[PDB]
Design a protein around this nucleic acid. Structure first.
Lengths: 226, 156, 202
RNA sequence: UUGGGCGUAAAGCGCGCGUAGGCGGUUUUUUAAGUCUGAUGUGAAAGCCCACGGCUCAACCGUGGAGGGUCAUUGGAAACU
RNA sequence: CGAAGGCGACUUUCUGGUCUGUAACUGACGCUGAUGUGCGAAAGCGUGGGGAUCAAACAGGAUUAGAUACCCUGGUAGUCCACGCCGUAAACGAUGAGUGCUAAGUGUUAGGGGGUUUCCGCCCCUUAGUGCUGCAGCUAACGCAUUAAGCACUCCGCCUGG
RNA sequence: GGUGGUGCAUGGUUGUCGUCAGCUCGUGUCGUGAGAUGUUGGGUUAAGUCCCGCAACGAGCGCAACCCUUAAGCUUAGUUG
């Protein structure tokens, strides 16, 4: 669906950021002020432009674009992962090897690699797969399924994401921009406004931000799908 | 909508253990000749294969030229770094008016009315830069005259 | 390049032994009757380009065991060359009746005796890439075990061979029961020796 | 200028300190002197537009208009001077 | 901080000048550039010292299978300060000096506005700078950049083969 | 037929970097370019063989107790042992 509720948005931690001089003059279009350093969202396009992000995803999911709700912050390694799952996707809770999509087309293979090594550990004849094999298979499995989840079983691509600190996690976005895809995001302070078409300095502490928007966007790929 | 043309090649041979390969790193323009001349590059290897293995990389991103057809009515040029060219517009009833390496890309975008003041540096890789500088920084006429608050011809 | 000449690679699983010889008497003359006859067919089979070595002397009722499976040269038509050797190779062996031959299935896949199939790809030195050396590009990727290719046969007077490489990759690369052999032949360098060292990989 | 730059590469000063000056910030306002003269008498050849004749084609020659549409001659007046 | 070479014991000086907070005020009254300004370190440099230290030379020693040399006391001057400087250093910014910015940030010397005053400290604005990075720009890249190796208005000189 | 000479005419013959445990390679992929992956920062066995953290994933090349060998049975049995 479209909008977040306003209270746990406001008071339960979206507007908060970090200290000044970790400063974003580039996200000034959504930054209101700072409380002894700790920034504040301009608290109106955190909902109005959130509805416009919903509409951006409406005609994206009405044709089959399910957004990956990504695991970057520590509640995102579980709950934003989880609403990615509610959307009908998997999660990303492991790290890049340093340029997989800016150096794209060899360990861009990791999409098929997780589609194959996981399914081969899963399919029949797992007994036939010996224990000498199963040792390394299970030592790699904890790193494998957590590696890539956006195109795991929703094996089309998401036309957006929901990032928090693309200040670092533009390793996904900016490297995928080789692949020419737009991104929406509930960003943190002193992060990227450019690669993300819709940024709001949303502190992660408001789980209303991840439920009544990002899981609500798992719902917008149902209502904004039909 | 892009333009089809071959640009060049290059045989890379690095100081390595065994025999030095000669991968024919090639740049190609591809499309069906609209006006939006889209070139690209590629690092490819085999003598008959590296044309297509490099056009593979070329078409990954092939650039747009928003082309004021007939002719860009005013002086049309551009620049990046050490690369640049110039084009003084002349009459279209003149045949082909071009320079040395820019001759076939003059035929790519359909204007064939401006001349090619072949300026720029002497750098071959950035010869492509000097070429594409001239026609990458363009903007149409009526859209600018609209963008400037007035009509298409209130400003004329 | 300070290299010795191998023959046997990994013998004990993959490499085997086709010793079926019973000519027990006269190691000076009856042995000669089956070893010196091997000095005979180097010329006639017309660029044989053959598979491997499978010799066998059937309890001294010696029917000659060298296949060279390119047909026609050893077949004839319903027992012409074989029946002719039934009377001719009585000087080779005791009887030598109806000498045999096989069918060769991608003979460039055979690790050992492929060297003739490629010595007759560049020894001509005249259209020595397409008319003759087509088969380096035909016999490339049938998945042979020993993956190593080189050619040195009279290219400008070359006294060494050639190699091709690129770079990346990860594997547990240790394997201990493969099969491969040598190659060395009789081109004339005219000043300083090189018998062409010649293999390909399928 | 139009159609070069000067760290390395064609080239940027131990140094700074200084007069004329070049240029230093201007805000208003008057002249017509210059900032595509008005229009014409108005224009060097192998050289301002066409017509020409002869040129074995040519090789090469010349001719008229256009005399220009190019200077002079007349002008006075912005939002710089 | 100085015109630089450069500028170092401290009580003090002029605190000249930087310097930021105030700047109390007539009306272009400046950078570079004819003028002209001075010197520039030492090697060396025109007097007593000076062989006192250090110190070339010499001695005298010898590596392991090699000196008088790395080695140097006596010691040659020299070294050095109370009377004369050259116009040279990696004085390099290989990067000339005026008007102003290039997302900007950055902790900070100075001087200030301050809140809180603290217990002379925490927080905000601050600039000559101080550094750090870092936007644009920059050149081939080295790499430069709110303080250039960029950006728009000033001059200078250089050179477009060496 | 050479022994008279040339390995040097080439088969060769072959001693020989060097058991180097190493030599690697594709799918490829980044660096405008002169440059970048494997076999990893913390801890584990006979032949470049990895995990929490590193640009990797996929095969060979020299070489498994490899088939003997020492063995425990047997097996086969009295034949000659």
């Amino acid at each position: 669906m479209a909008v977040i509720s306003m209270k746990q948005l406001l008071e339960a931690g979206v507007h908060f950021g970090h200290q000044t001089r970790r400063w974003n003059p580039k996200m000034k279009k959504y930054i209101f002020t700072e409380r002894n350093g700790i920034y504040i969202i301009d608290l109106q396009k955190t909902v109005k432009k959130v509805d416009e992000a919903y509409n951006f995803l409406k005609q994206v999911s009405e044709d089959g674009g399910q957004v990956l709700f990504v695991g970057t912050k520590k509640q995102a390694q579980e709950s934003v992962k989880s609403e990615a799952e509610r959307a009908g996707q998997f999660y990303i809770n492991q790290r890049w090897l340093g340029g997989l999509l800016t150096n794209y087309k060899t360990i861009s293979k990791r999409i098929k690699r997780i589609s194959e090594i996981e399914k081969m550990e899963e399919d029949g004849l797992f007994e036939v797969l010996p224990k000498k094999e199963v040792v390394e298979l299970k030592k790699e499995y904890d790193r494998l399924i957590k590696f890539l989840g956006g195109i795991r079983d929703m094996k089309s691509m998401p036309q957006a994401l929901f990032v928090v600190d693309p200040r670092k996690e533009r390793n996904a976005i900016a490297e995928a921009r080789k692949l020419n895809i737009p991104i929406v995001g509930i960003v943190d302070t002193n992060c990227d406004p450019d690669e993300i078409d819709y940024v709001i300095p949303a502190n992660d502490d408001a789980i209303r931000a991840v439920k009544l928007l990002t899981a609500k966007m798992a719902d917008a790929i149902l209502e904004g799908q039909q | 909508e892009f333009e089809e043309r071959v640009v060049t090649i290059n045989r890379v041979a690095k100081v390595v253990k065994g025999g030095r390969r000669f991968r024919f790193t090639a740049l190609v323009v591809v499309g069906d000749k609209n006006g939006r001349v889209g070139f690209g590059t590629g690092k490819a290897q085999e003598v008959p294969e590296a044309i297509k293995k490099a056009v593979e990389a070329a078409k990954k991103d092939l650039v747009v030229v928003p082309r004021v057809e007939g002719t860009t009515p005013h002086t049309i040029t551009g620049r990046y770094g050490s690369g640049s060219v110039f084009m003084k517009p002349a009459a279209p009833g003149t045949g082909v008016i071009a320079g040395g390496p820019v001759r076939a890309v003059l035929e790519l975008a359909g204007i064939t009315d401006i001349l090619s003041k072949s300026l720029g540096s002497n750098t071959p890789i950035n010869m492509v830069r000097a070429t594409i500088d001239g026609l990458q920084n363009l903007k149409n006429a009526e859209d600018v005259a609209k963008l400037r608050g007035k009509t298409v011809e209130e400003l004329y | 390049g300070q290299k010795i000449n191998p023959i046997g690679l990994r013998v004990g699983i993959i490499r085997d032994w086709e010793a079926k010889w019973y000519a027990e008497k006269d190691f000076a003359s009856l042995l000669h009757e089956d070893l010196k006859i091997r000095k005979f067919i180097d010329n006639e089979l017309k660029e044989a380009s053959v598979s491997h070595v499978e010799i066998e002397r059937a309890a001294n009722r010696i029917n000659i065991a060298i296949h060279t499976g390119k047909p026609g040269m050893v077949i004839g038509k319903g027992g012409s060359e074989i029946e002719k050797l039934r009377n001719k190779l009585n000087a080779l062996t005791d009887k030598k009746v109806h000498i045999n031959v096989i069918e060769i299935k991608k003979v460039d896949l055979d690790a050992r005796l492929v060297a003739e199939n490629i010595a007759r790809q560049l020894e001509n030195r005249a259209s020595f890439r397409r008319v003759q050396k087509q088969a380096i590009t035909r016999a490339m990727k049938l998945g042979a075990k020993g993956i190593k290719t080189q050619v040195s046969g009279r290219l400008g007077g070359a006294d060494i061979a050639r190699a091709e490489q690129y770079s990346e990759g990860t594997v547990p690369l240790h394997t201990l029961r493969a099969d491969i052999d040598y190659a060395h032949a009789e081109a004339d360098t005219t000043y300083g020796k090189l018998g062409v060292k010649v293999w390909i990989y399928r």
